[PDB]
Design an enzyme around this catalytic site. Structure first.
Site, short mmCIF file in Angstrom:
data_model
loop_
_atom_site.label_atom_id
_atom_site.label_comp_id
_atom_site.label_asym_id
_atom_site.label_seq_id
_atom_site.Cartn_x
_atom_site.Cartn_y
_atom_site.Cartn_z
N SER A 195 -13.34 -10.33 -21.83
CA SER A 195 -11.97 -10.77 -21.94
C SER A 195 -11.42 -9.98 -23.07
CB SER A 195 -11.88 -12.25 -22.29
OG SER A 195 -12.29 -12.47 -23.63
N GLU A 224 -8.39 -12.15 -38.42
CA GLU A 224 -8.50 -11.85 -36.98
C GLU A 224 -8.11 -10.42 -36.58
OE1 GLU A 224 -10.21 -12.91 -34.70
OE2 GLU A 224 -10.56 -15.08 -34.85
N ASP A 229 -9.30 -9.20 -26.02
CA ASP A 229 -8.51 -9.99 -26.92
C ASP A 229 -7.32 -9.12 -27.24
OD1 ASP A 229 -10.43 -12.09 -27.01
OD2 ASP A 229 -11.54 -11.04 -28.59
N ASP A 278 -3.01 -28.36 -26.89
CA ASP A 278 -4.10 -28.30 -26.00
C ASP A 278 -5.05 -29.47 -26.31
OD1 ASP A 278 -5.80 -26.83 -24.17
OD2 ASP A 278 -6.98 -26.18 -25.91
N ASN A 293 -7.77 -13.64 -25.74
CA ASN A 293 -8.45 -13.00 -24.60
C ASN A 293 -7.62 -13.08 -23.31
OD1 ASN A 293 -9.96 -15.59 -23.06
ND2 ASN A 293 -9.42 -15.81 -25.22
N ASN A 318 -14.21 -8.14 -25.64
CA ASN A 318 -15.38 -8.92 -26.01
C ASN A 318 -16.55 -8.61 -25.10
OD1 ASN A 318 -13.95 -10.21 -27.98
ND2 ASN A 318 -12.97 -11.45 -26.38
N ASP A 355 -17.91 -10.49 -23.40
CA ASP A 355 -17.52 -11.35 -22.30
C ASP A 355 -16.41 -10.72 -21.45
OD1 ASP A 355 -15.04 -11.59 -23.48
OD2 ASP A 355 -16.03 -12.76 -25.04
C1 LIG Z 1 -14.66 -12.99 -31.98
C2 LIG Z 1 -13.40 -13.07 -31.14
O1 LIG Z 1 -12.39 -12.40 -31.33
N1 LIG Z 1 -13.47 -13.99 -30.09
C3 LIG Z 1 -12.28 -14.50 -29.33
C4 LIG Z 1 -11.42 -15.48 -30.18
O2 LIG Z 1 -10.58 -14.82 -31.19
C5 LIG Z 1 -10.54 -16.30 -29.24
O3 LIG Z 1 -10.02 -17.39 -30.05
C6 LIG Z 1 -11.27 -16.84 -27.99
C7 LIG Z 1 -10.46 -17.77 -27.09
O4 LIG Z 1 -11.23 -18.44 -26.14
O5 LIG Z 1 -11.62 -15.72 -27.24
C8 LIG Z 1 -12.75 -15.11 -27.95
O6 LIG Z 1 -13.63 -16.20 -28.24
#
Ligand SMILES: CC(=O)N[C@@H]1[C@@H](O)[C@H](O)[C@@H](CO)O[C@@H]1O
Length: 129
Positions: free
Chosen positions: A50, A35, A52, A101, A59, A46, A48
């Site tokens: 968020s 990771e 990380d 969770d 995130n 990301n 997205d």
């Molecule tokens: C590829 C990457 O780093 N994606 C992250 C993941 O590490 C994390 O567990 C997740 C939680 O919802 O957020 C994103 O999916």
């Protein structure tokens, strides 16, 4: 920091991870190499948005405080940057919970594919604990 193979993983058993909550000792250190590659300062945003954070790759969306993720729950109640520093003494109270969770590792993506169906003890092997 920059941690070694047998040196980055002796502190989990210092933080309640040995066979904690249904997860065994061989099942942990594998993903760390998967990771942020034994590096705590490796943080990435990301698509997205968020961001990380840490070796843990968490995130800002669901778990922590960065301010760029609005509507973020921030259940962990700790600044995201509160992990990345050399001392991670507290970084795990949240991960220790992220599993209760009922999803467990469902949050972590790398393991489910890279450490799932693996020879996990092959990671914890060769080291004195
Ligand atoms: C590829 C990457 O780093 N994606 C992250 C993941 O590490 C994390 O567990 C997740 C939680 O919802 O957020 C994103 O999916």
């Amino acid at each position: 920091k920059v941690f070694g193979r047998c040196e980055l993983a002796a502190a989990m058993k210092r933080h309640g991870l040995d066979n904690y909550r249904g997860y065994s000792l061989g099942n942990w250190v594998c993903a760390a190499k998967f990771e942020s590659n034994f590096n705590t300062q490796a943080t990435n945003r990301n698509t997205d948005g968020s961001t990380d954070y840490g070796i843990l790759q968490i995130n800002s969306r669901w778990w922590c405080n960065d301010g760029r993720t609005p509507g973020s729950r921030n259940l962990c109640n700790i600044p995201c940057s509160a992990l990345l520093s050399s001392d991670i003494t507290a970084s795990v109270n949240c991960a220790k919970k992220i599993v209760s969770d009922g999803n467990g590792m469902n949050a972590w993506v790398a393991w489910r594919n890279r450490c799932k169906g693996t020879d996990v003890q092959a990671w914890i092997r060769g080291c004195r604990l």
